[PDB]
Copies of this chain bind each other. A is one copy, B any other.
Amino acid sequence: MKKRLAYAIIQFLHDQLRHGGLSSDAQESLEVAIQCLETAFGVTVED
C-alpha cells in the first residue's frame, strides 16, 4: 500500500475542508472521508 501518497491526500483534504470554499454538506463528507482514509491506510497527519 502507498501510505505516503495517502498521507499527502489526507493533507490536501484537511486543507480543502477548511479553505476549499466547499458547502457545509461537502465538508461533512470530507470529514468522514478523512477518517476513513486514516483507517484504510493506517496513517494520520502529524501536527
Q: Tell me how far the C-beta of A26 lies from the nearest C-beta in chain B, rounded to whole angstroms.
A: 4
A12 touches B20 (CB 8 A): no
Residue total for A at the interface (Cβ-Cβ under 8 A):
24
Residues of A within 8 A of B (CB): 1-2, 5-6, 9, 12-13, 16, 20-22, 26-27, 29-30, 32-34, 36-37, 39-42
Contacts A13-B37, A33-B33 known; 20 new A-B pairs at CB < 8 A: A1-B22, A2-B16, A2-B20, A5-B12, A6-B16, A9-B9, A9-B12, A9-B13, A26-B40, A26-B41, A26-B42, A29-B37, A29-B39, A32-B32, A32-B33, A33-B34, A33-B36, A33-B37, A33-B40, A36-B36
